[PDB]
Amino acid sequence: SQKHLQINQTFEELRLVTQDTENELKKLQQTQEYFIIQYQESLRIQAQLAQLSPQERLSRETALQQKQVSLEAWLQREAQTLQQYRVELAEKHQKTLQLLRKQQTIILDDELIQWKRRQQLAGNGGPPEGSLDVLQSWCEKLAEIIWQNRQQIRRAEHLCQQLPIPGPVEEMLAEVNATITDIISALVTSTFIIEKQPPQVLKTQTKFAATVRLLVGGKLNVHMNPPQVKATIISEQQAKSLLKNENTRSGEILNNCCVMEYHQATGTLSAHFRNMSLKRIKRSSVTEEKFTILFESQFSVGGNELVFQVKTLSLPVVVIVHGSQDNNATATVLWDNAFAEPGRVPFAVPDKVLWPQLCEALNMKFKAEVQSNRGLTKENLVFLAQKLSSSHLEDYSGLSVSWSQFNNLPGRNYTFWQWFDGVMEVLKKHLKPHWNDGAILGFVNKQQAHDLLINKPDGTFLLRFSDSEIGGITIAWKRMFWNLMPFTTRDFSIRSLADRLGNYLIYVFPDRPKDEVYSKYYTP
């Protein structure tokens, strides 16, 4: 990529200028030592007093003062140049930190946000986030560069303070040393990211896993004394108040908190959470209130001087006491993961969303749950729109759907999302390859399937989703069409749809014989 090349070239450029500055600092150190050892001779000659005899006394005193004025010129003539060297060095340091601020903002506020958005979208079966072993190298190099610069600034300040030529150096060194602290604090607080999220909607008293990382921890000696991270859970209100610096030392109780291990090869410092559990929750619609898992730690960098308390918020989660509440709550989660604004307060979401983005997210999670590449075609989306009217997708191109109208009761005990997720479940458990084989209609309705089997020969099939039961399917036949009572999930768990079809009906979905579609799925 062009941006990758740009930022890598910028990284190598920063490394080059930092090595330049290190060379200049070493030269300044050796030069100051030379200046001190040459200065010692000024005191050596300022005592060569003796009181021998008036003639030689006056002659030698005049000669000594004539040498002393030349020494007082030579010195301070070299010292002014030393001060100029130091000022130029401080200017180089300041320019380096300006470039550092630019590059760090580019890394954090642009690329990490992209990775986190990819994570949110993979939450609903989008493209996977991607390995952290590309941002890891960038962050490690950032940390190395800023640490070398802080070290150079510190040693330059100490070496200039032992020979304190006042000048303007003290101001510039109260400054840009003022800026390195902001840079390193932003970095250490912003590289505590969640690698593998804790699962969205999760039931109590069930084990779940989550893994966090410290990106820059590989080089900053925090792995020497590895800090342990603790995981808590807080409702949306406490999560909002926390970012507002409202000190509140809530939500529910976890069962585990653990230390961060280190991979010596990839140089990654990470905390795995493999046996976490939620045993008690303090709730204030149960399937709609969102919680978040906060991970927090505290550690030190270098000596005992630099301490950092760091915290990170995991993506919103919904607690589900009884298992039967699962299917609904996921909707809420998806909605957040579908429409999270960039700079929004924790779990703030726009009540009404456009239809195209809605069917986009629906197709995404559908291709996710079915584990197939069939997805929602244009006619299927048109049918879904007609369920929630005219039969052109261009008509629904500018309509808006509220959350209340999404997950209501369109015409029965359903709610549109619940029916969609029910068909998702029924073909995710028993009808994955049958959906991938092009055998389930998916966009067939009453009197829409009937007109598709009148001009066709006898015995043809069509498997649509039943609009009487939630997770069931209805078939077709051959004068009039012959439906049936819905095939409940149980009716598949006892004899799947592949063997239930095994005699009178021979064709599916015009000409394709029943065997050529289901011969590889009968019980031998």
Numbering used by the authors: 138 to 185, 189 to 389, 393 to 427, 434 to 537, 541 to 559, 562 to 632, 638 to 661, 664 to 685
Paste lines from the article:
In order to gain insight into the structural basis of the N642H mutation, as well as to validate modeling studies on the differences between STAT5A/B, we crystalized human STAT5B. With these domain boundaries, human STAT5B was crystallized and diffracted to 3.29 Å resolution. The overall architecture of human STAT5B is analogous to mouse STAT5A with a rmsd of 1.21 Å, and a rmsd of 1.89 Å and 2.03 Å, in comparison to mouse STAT3 and human STAT1 respectively. Within these domain boundaries, there are 29 amino acid differences between human STAT5B and mouse STAT5A, which are predominantly located within disordered regions and the SH2 domain. Conventional phospho-peptide binding occurs perpendicular to the central β-sheet with the phospho-Tyr accessing the N-terminal (pY) pocket on one face of the β-sheet and the flanking residues occupying the C-terminal (pY + 3) cavity on the opposite face. The pY-binding pocket is positively charged and harbors a number of evolutionarily conserved residues, such as an invariant arginine (R618 on βB5), that form part of the complex phosphate coordination network. The hydrophobic pY + 3 cavity serves as the peptide selectivity pocket and is predominantly formed by the βD strand and αB helix. As such, the surface-exposed βD strand controls access to both the phosphate-coordinating βB5 position and the selectivity residues located deeper in each of the N- and C- terminal pockets. The SH2 domain is a hot-spot for several mutations with the most prevalent mutations occurring either on the βD strand (such as N642H) or in close proximity ( < 5 Å apart), suggesting a common mechanism of action.
Unphosphorylated STATs form an anti-parallel dimer/monomer equilibrium, and upon efficient recruitment to the cognate receptor–kinase complex, are phosphorylated on a specific tyrosine residue, which promotes parallel dimerization by conformational rearrangement. The canonical domains of the STAT family are all present with the coiled-coil domain (CCD, S138-T331), DNA-binding domain (DBD, F332-V470), linker domain (H471-D591), and SH2 domain (Q592-P685).
